[PDB]
Amino acid sequence: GPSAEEFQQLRKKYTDAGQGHVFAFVDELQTGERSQLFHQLSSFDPVRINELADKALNPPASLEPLPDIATASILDSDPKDLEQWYEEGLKLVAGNKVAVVLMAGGQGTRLGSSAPKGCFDIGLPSHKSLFQIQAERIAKLQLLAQRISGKEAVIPWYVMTSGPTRKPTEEFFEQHKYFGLNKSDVIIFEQGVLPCISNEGKILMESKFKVAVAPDGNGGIYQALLTSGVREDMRKRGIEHIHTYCVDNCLVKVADPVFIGFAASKQVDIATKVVRKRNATESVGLILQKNGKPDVVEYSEIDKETAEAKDPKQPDVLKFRAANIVNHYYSFKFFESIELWAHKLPHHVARKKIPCIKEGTGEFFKPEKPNGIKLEQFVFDVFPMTPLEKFACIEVRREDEFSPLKNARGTGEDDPDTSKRDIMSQGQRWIEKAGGIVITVGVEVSPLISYGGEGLEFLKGREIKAPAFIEK
Ligand SMILES: CC(=O)N[C@H]1[C@@H](OP(=O)(O)O)O[C@H](CO)[C@@H](O)[C@@H]1O
Ligand SMILES: OCCc1ccc(O)cc1
Ligand SMILES: OCCc1ccc(O)cc1
Ligand SMILES: OCCc1ccc(O)cc1
């Protein structure tokens, strides 16, 4: 393990930085525990931690709805354009130019599962997990693309996890044989962490030999794409277009060809999907403009007066209603610039009850009130680095595209039951549109049968008894 000299040099750095309390219990640690503490502390720069704590604890507009050059809506689109963008998106898939990054490092504190959120079974007839439904969407788009190329189509799946989720995620994917995808085209990687900070700016000790850390927010994606090797893998594959999304949306149109096609046609660096906000209290970030710059306002920071503000000309409708649904497109060229701006991203403060050592006794205690803060970066904080002309915000239909799993069963909204209803409602609607008659709520349609409502003609004239599950 670490030499005395190495350990003293580390101790000097931390002590000079006013963080020498992290070594309060060194004299009683076992060799292994001492090693852990050494390596963990070596992984942070205590001066940087001080810089972050200082900005957090002693912190240092032109703020209207997005302009019309920057916005589009599926509702207002010419159907011939939607068809063309879909075809162009599928051609890019067939070209092996499309990748997916899945943000699955969330805890799911509101959901109360012990397992990764992606593993959750919302109670469909199939009992498929969120991960498996997403994987099957990828499989299906590959198969559709192969129809046009006559060659293998691969959409690599890069799954970002946290330390709370990485091992069980990999085990789950392995036990399912990667849901019929090739393991060689799925990479599970971890996002980074930052130390939790006390109200007084001091690093919190989880144990006598471990610093309390937390994942660094979904904005941690960008640094993690470099350190993980993922960006290099995309380069080696000739990836040009990336779809990034959150695991909790059970209706997510993974690698949606119309989205990719549209974004690519406009040659944007970034595109993003929104829906109309369902009310002033919905826990969604709101996409709007700031200071000549596309930007977002998170639900945890917005002020009542803006969440409740009304449209100038229509006083019964909310002014800000472009709910961020965490559904983003990037050019690969954008990812090649990460190094120039990853350090420019802000840290957002969240005050938290961080279980730690009673700084004295060494007794582990869950505190009664918030004893410190976690810092997080947010994926959308790149939007202001991007010229308005290299940005697109598209309205899509909530009932087809956005059904988040946030809360435990019995909450009443954004829960397993709303998720299940939304998928099975989608299924029924697709069947009906293809000429099927459903007798009854709803019908689960496997993604391997239909990605987006296509391919259901074989049900024309048929009677389907709901609840049902259409599969192989
Ligand atoms: C940083 C980030 O991506 N935040 C997202 C994300 O919030 P959560 O706090 O992870 O629930 O999901 C919302 C949609 O469910 C979206 O509106 C919001 O902006
Ligand atoms: O618990 C004794 C360790 C300690 C060291 C430095 C400080 O500033 C405070 C506490
Ligand atoms: O980057 C994480 C550094 C780290 C190293 C060793 C540990 O035992 C724990 C954390
Ligand atoms: O004009 C908007 C076209 C459009 C529709 C749906 C998407 O997902 C993306 C773009």
φ, ψ for residue 161, nearest 5 deg: -120, 170
Q: How far is the CA of 188 from the centre of ligand 3 (A)?
A: 19
Q: Which residues lie closer than 8 Å to 438 by C-beta, 6 or more apart?
A: 428, 431, 432, 463, 464, 465, 466, 468
Query: Which residue among 21, 23, 203 is best mutated to probe the pocket of ligand 2, counting the most ligand atoms within 8 A of its Cβ?
Result: 21
Is residue 428 within 8 A of residue 451, CB to CB? The reply is no
Q: Which ligand is nearest to the CA of 41?
A: 3
296/313 Cα distance (integer angstroms): 23
CA–CA–CA angle 379, 134, 418 (5° rounding):
85
Picking from 174, 100, 166, the residue whose alpha carbon sits closest to that of residue 139 is 100
Q: Are 392 and 268 a contacting pair, CB within 8 Å? A: yes
Q: Which residues pair with 270 in a beta bridge?
A: 330, 391
Q: How many CB atoms lie under 10 A from the CB of residue 292?
A: 10
Nearest CA to ligand 4 atom 5: 74
**CA–CA distance, 377 with 223 (Å, rounded to integer):** 11
Residue 72 CA, distance from chain mean position: 22
* Contact between residue 285 and residue 328 where contact means Cβ atoms under 8 Å apart: no
Mutate which of 22, 30, 36 for ligand 3? The one with the most ligand atoms within 8 Å of its CB, which is: 36
Tell me if 207 CB under 6 Å of ligand 3.
no
Task: For residue 169, report the distance from its CA to the centre of ligand 1, in Å.
Answer: 21
Residue 179 · residue 135 · CB < 8 Å: yes
Phi, psi torsion values for 222, nearest 5 degrees: -65, -50
Instruction: Compute φ and ψ for 301, nearest 5 degrees.
Output: -120, -20
CA distances from 325 to 132, 159, 245, 289 (A): 20, 18, 8, 17
Nearest CA to ligand 3 atom 7: 40
Resolution in angstrom units:
1.6
| Spatial CB neighbours of 313, under 8 Å, sequence gap ≥ 6 | none
Closest by CA to 32, choosing from 2, 65, 62, is 2
CA 357 to the chain's CA centroid: 32
Give the 3-state DSSP-derived string for the chain, with helices as H, strands as E and coil as C. CCCHHHHHHHHHHHHHCCCHHHHCCHHHCCHHHHHHHHHHHHCCCHHHHHHHHHHHHCCCCCCCCCCHHHEEEHHHCCHHHHHHHHHHHHHHHHCCCEEEEEECCCCCCCCCCCCCHHHCECCCCCCCEHHHHHHHHHHHHHHHHHHHHCCCCCCCEEEEECCCCHHHHHHHHHHCHHHHCCHHHEEEEECCEEECEECCCCECEEECCEECEEECCHHHHHHHHHHCCHHHHHHHHCCCEEEEEECCECCCCCCCHHHHHHHHHHCCCEEEEEEECCCCCCCCCEEEEECCEEEEECCCCCCHHHHCCECCCCCCCECCCEEEEEEEEEEHHHHCCHHHCHHHCCCEEEEECCCEECCCCCCEECCCCCCEEEEECCHHHHHHHCCHHHEEEEECCHHHHCCECCCCCCCCCCCHHHHHHHHHHHHHHHHHHCCCEEECCCEEECCCCCCCCCCCHHHCCCEEECCEEECC
Reply yes or no: is the peptide bond before residue 467 cis, omega within 30 of 0.
Answer: yes
Give CA–CA dist 328/409, Å, rounded.
Answer: 28
CA angle 80, 84, 90 (to 5 degrees): 145
Ligand 1: residue whose CA is nearest its atom 17:
284
**Token code pair at residue 378:** 């947010």
Query: Hey, whose CA ends up nearest to atom 9 of ligand 4?
Result: 259
Compute the distance from residue 35 Cα to the ligand 3 centre, in Å: 10
Q: How was this structure determined?
A: X-ray
Residue with tokens 């060689």: 184
What are the chain's domains? 1-43 (no CATH), 62-406 (3.90.550.10), 425-472 (no CATH)
The answer to the question of whether 71 is labelled as a binding residue is: yes
45 labelled binding-site residue: no
Q: How far is the CA of 202 from the centre of ligand 2 (A)?
A: 10
* Dihedral sign computed on CA atoms, order 240, 395, 137, 216: positive
Residue 404 CB less than 6 A away from ligand 1: yes
- Rounded to the nearest angstrom, the distance between the alpha carbon of 20 and the centre of ligand 2 is 6
Of 329, 326, 338, 328, which is closest to residue 223 (Cα–Cα)? Answer: 338
- Closest residue to atom 9 of ligand 2, CA basis: 21
For residue 4, report the distance from its CA to the centre of ligand 3, in Å: 19
Q: Return the residues preceding each gap in the chain, C–N over 2.5 A, or none.
A: 60, 440
SS (H, E, C) 137-155: HHHHHHHHHHHHHCCCCCC
Task: Answer whether 211's CB lies under 8 Å from 205's CB.
Answer: yes
Nearest-CA neighbor of 435 among 458, 468, 452? 458
CB 72 within 8 A of CB 216: no
Residues in the chain: 472
> Which residues contact ligand 4 via a Cβ below 6 A?
72, 74, 77, 82, 256, 258-259, 262, 273, 394, 396
Alpha carbons 279 and 301: distance in angstroms, whole number: 17
CA 108 – ligand 4 centroid, Å? 30
